[PDB]
Amino acid sequence: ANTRVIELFDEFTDLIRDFIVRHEITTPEYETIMQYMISVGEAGEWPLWLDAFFETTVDSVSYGKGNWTSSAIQGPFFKEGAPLLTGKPATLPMRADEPGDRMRFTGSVRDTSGTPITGAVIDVWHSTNDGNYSFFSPALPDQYLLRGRVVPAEDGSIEFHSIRPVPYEIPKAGPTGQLMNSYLGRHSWRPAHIHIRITADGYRPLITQLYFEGDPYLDSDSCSAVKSELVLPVNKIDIDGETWQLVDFNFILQHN
C-alpha cells in the first residue's frame, strides 16, 4: 500500500540512521547485528522474537484500555479448527494423567450493559505443565490437546476444566534465548498463563491471556505482556490427592 508504507519507512529509516549515528555503531557492531538477525531467520524465530518484544504494543494500539475486557498478545501459538466441547463439565482434550494441579475456570460473557452474549464461541489453549504447546512440540502429538472451543450458557456463564498451566521458559538455546538469557543477561521465562480468543457474530473479536497471583514472573515477563487487570485471584482447593486450582473471570465485549 504505497503511501502508508512510504510514510513509515522513511520515518523508520531516519529513526535507525539517527540511532546508528548517536551511538557511533561501528562496523563490527553492524556486522554482529546483521549476523544476529540472520541467526533468528535461520531458526524459526521471527514471530517468536517479534511477538516477544513488540506485540504487547501492537496490541495496546489495536484495542486499547477501557471497560471492555482488556485484550492481550495473541502469541505465536494459536491453532484454528479446535474442537467444539460439550461434555459433563466440558473438559479440554488432554492425555491421561496429564500432570500436576487440576484447574477450574468459571466466568461470564456479557456486553457493555451486562446482557449475556449467547452467540459467543470461545477458543482457548495453553501450554502443558511441562512448557510445551502441542502443534509446536516434538514431545507432543500434532493434535488438539489443551486446546478447545467452548460455548456459553444462555444464562451468560461458562466453564471448563484443564490442568494448571505454569511458567514457560522460551528456548534457552534460541537466538531469542541467547539475547534474553546471555547478552541481555536476564531470563527467558513467561508467567503461567492461558490464552483465550472469543468470536461472536455482531461483536468484535477479542484475544487475551490470564495469569496467576503469586506468579513469580509477573513483574518481569520476557514478553512484557502482563496487564494487572488480567491477573487471576487463585483459590487453592485440596480435593484430596489431586490439589485443584479454581479461577473465575468475567468477559465484557467490544460490541462493534
**Residues making up the binding site:** 133, 168, 193, 195
Closest residue by beta carbon to ligand MYY: 1
CA distance 157 to 35: 51
* Residue 19 binding ligand MYY, by CB under 6 A: yes
For 126, other C-beta atoms within 10 Å of its C-beta total 25
Q: Name residue 252's amino acid.
A: I
Local structure of residue 116 (DSSP, 8 states): B
Provide the minimum distance between the beta carbon of 142 and ligand MYY in the complex, in angstroms, as a whole number.
28
DSSP state of 71: P
CB of 12 vs ligand MYY, minimal distance in Å? 4
Footprint of Fe ion on residues 62-91 (CB under 5 A)?
A: 75, 77
Which residue's CB is nearer to ligand MYY, number 5 or number 84?
A: 5
Q: How far is the CB of 198 from ligand HQN (least distance, A)?
A: 16
Which residues, 6+ apart, have CB-to-CB distance to 256 below 8 Å?
Answer: 202, 203, 204
Sheet with strand 147-150: strands edge to edge: 147-150, 120-125, 194-200, 206-212, 231-232
CB-CB contact of 92 with 161 (8 Å): yes
* Under rule CB under 8 A, residue 17 binds a second copy: yes
Chain residues that interact with a second copy, rule: CB under 8 A: 1-2, 4-6, 8-9, 11-13, 15-17, 19-21, 23-27, 29-30, 33-34, 37-38, 40-42, 46-47, 50, 53-55, 57-62, 179, 182-185
- Kindly list the residues in this chain that would bind ligand MYY in the complex (CB under 6 A): 1-2, 4-5, 8-9, 12, 16, 19, 25, 29, 32-33, 36-37, 179, 183
